[PDB]
Amino acid sequence: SHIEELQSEETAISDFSTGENVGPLALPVGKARQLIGLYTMAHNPNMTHLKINLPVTALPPLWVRCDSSDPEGT
Amino acid sequence: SFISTENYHTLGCLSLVAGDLASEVPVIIGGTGNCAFSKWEPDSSKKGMTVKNLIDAEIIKGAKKFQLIDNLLFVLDTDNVLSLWDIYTLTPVWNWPSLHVEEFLLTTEADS
């Protein structure tokens, strides 16, 4: 997204890709904890809900990917 | 043996709690700085404790006081807000933001 406007005749030592694409990835563990907390709160009858006046309906589980950015190994 | 938290708690450690769960000694230290929470456990192959878990000072900037009854780490943050935490993995279990609790004490007729 830029236009080259400087001439560099020096030799550069670097590697390049020719068709690799990044597939599905994993969220950070701190990011995963926030979403796990949100799922836990949304299905807790003891929350002071702001949009629901009825007991919360159960839903199949949530599973958030973790990149093991912490020494938990999770 | 002095273990320095100067590389993780740059603004001084505020509260410390020690327990014995999962055949370990989880020492949770809550302070302000780079990391709000530091979980130290004794290294079985050495003489000292090493960090096992770290919580960044992003949601909670630090902990003022701890009270570990059993598998429940009641964490009081720097905003005088109490919360319920699970010590096994430090996941958000409950929060009490409505009550500005400057200090909380848990008392029960303990038998075991």
| Secondary structure of residue B54 in the 3-state scheme | strand
Written as six digits, the tokens of B95 are 């929060």
* Measured distance CA(B70)–CA(B85) in Å, rounded: 11
Asked if A33 contacts A70 with a C-beta cutoff of 8 angstroms, the reply is no
Pull the structure tokens for residue A74: 């999770």
B 82-101: CB under 8 A from A:
89, 91-93, 98
Chain B interface includes A68 (CB < 8 A): no
Give the count of Cβ contacts less than 8 A between chain A and B.
Answer: 24
Contacts of B4 (CB under 8 A, 6+ apart): none
Cβ distance of B54 and A74 shorter than 8 Å: no
Tell me, yes or no, if A31 comes closer than 8 A to chain B by beta carbon: no
CA-derived radius of gyration, chain B: 14
Minimum distance, in Å, between the CA of residue B68 and any CA atom of chain A = 21
Query: With b meaning 16 or more CB within 10 Å and e meaning fewer, what string describes A3-37?
Result: eeeeeeeeeeeeeeeeeeeeeeeeeebeebbeebb
